[PDB]
Amino acid sequence: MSLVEATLEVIGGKWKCVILCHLTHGKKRTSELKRLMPNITQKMLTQQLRELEADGVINRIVYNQVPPKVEYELSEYGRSLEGILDMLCAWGANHINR
Amino acid sequence: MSLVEATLEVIGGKWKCVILCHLTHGKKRTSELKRLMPNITQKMLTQQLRELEADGVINRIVYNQVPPKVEYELSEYGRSLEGILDMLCAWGANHINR
């Protein structure tokens, strides 16, 4: 395998960057992420979140209350992806105009 | 859709970014790409090459000869993704090497 392939396993796909984009503007529960992302199933969303947590890119916050409450936030390490996120957004802006 | 989503529509599909990566070395026909990406199916590769062409990031070169042959190259527009690729690898290298 290659570095590119290896890195894509962490931040590739059509969902992770969208999730991170949403989290750059604040912590969110899975239900909020699901609402904001109609093209993804709950199952796939949960799987994407578990991978991102595993990779140390987002932190899972569990509020010990009833009903249950779980929120996700970009970790300190995850913030190091902001530069790439900005580039993707800039490229997308130009593309839409194309 | 958001700006990030627009970009992922073009490069988020499975294998798309790797394909573009391989094409940064030069034009190649489907057979070669198959050898470089031993895990992609013929149908999937065909599907992705078509989407990449439609989004304008790669150009397909048709050789009207005997035997007929077709190659793919990174379009000038596709070249504008090299910077994102550079940062992705830079980030991935820092990630894997812990």
A14: which DSSP letter? Answer: S
Put simply, the answer to whether B96 touches A3 (Cβ < 8 Å) is: yes
**Between the CA of residue B13 and those of A61, B19, B38, B47, what are the distances in Å?**
30, 11, 17, 10
Taking the C-alpha atoms of residue A33 and residue A23, their distance in angstroms, rounded to an integer, is: 9
H helices present in A1-98, as ranges? 3-11, 16-24, 30-36, 42-54, 82-97
Structural domain total, chain B: 1
Domain residue limits at A97: 2-98
d(CA A28, CA A72): 5
Resolution of the determined structure in angstroms stands at 2.0
Contact residues on chain B for A79, CB-CB shorter than 8 A: none
String of DSSP letters for A33-46: HHHH-TTS-HHHHH
Q: What is the strand order of the sheet A69-74 is part of?
A: A28-29, A69-74, A58-63
Give how far B69 is from chain A: nearest CA, Å: 28
Per the listing, tokens 């962490």 go with A10
Q: Is A63 helix (H, G, I), strand (E, B) or coil?
A: strand
How close does chain A come to B60, measured CA to CA in Å?
A: 19
- Residue B3 DSSP SS3: helix
Q: List chain A residues with CB under 8 Å of B10.
A: 95
Chain B residues in contact with A94 by the CB 8 A cut-off are 80
- List the one residue out of A5, A21, A16 whose CA is nearest residue A49: A16
CATH number at residue B32: 1.10.10.10
Report the SS3 class of residue A2: coil
Contact B58, B10 (CB under 8 A): no
Element (H, E) at A71: strand A69-74
Cα distances from B89 to residues A6, B10, B14, B76, in angstroms, run 9, 18, 17, 21
3-state secondary structure of B11: helix
**Cβ neighbours around B75 below 10 Å, total:** 17
Q: Which of B7, B87, B96 sits opposite A95 (nearest CB)?
A: B7
Q: Are A59 and A73 in contact (CB under 8 A)?
A: yes
Helix (H, G, I), strand (E, B) or coil at B26: coil
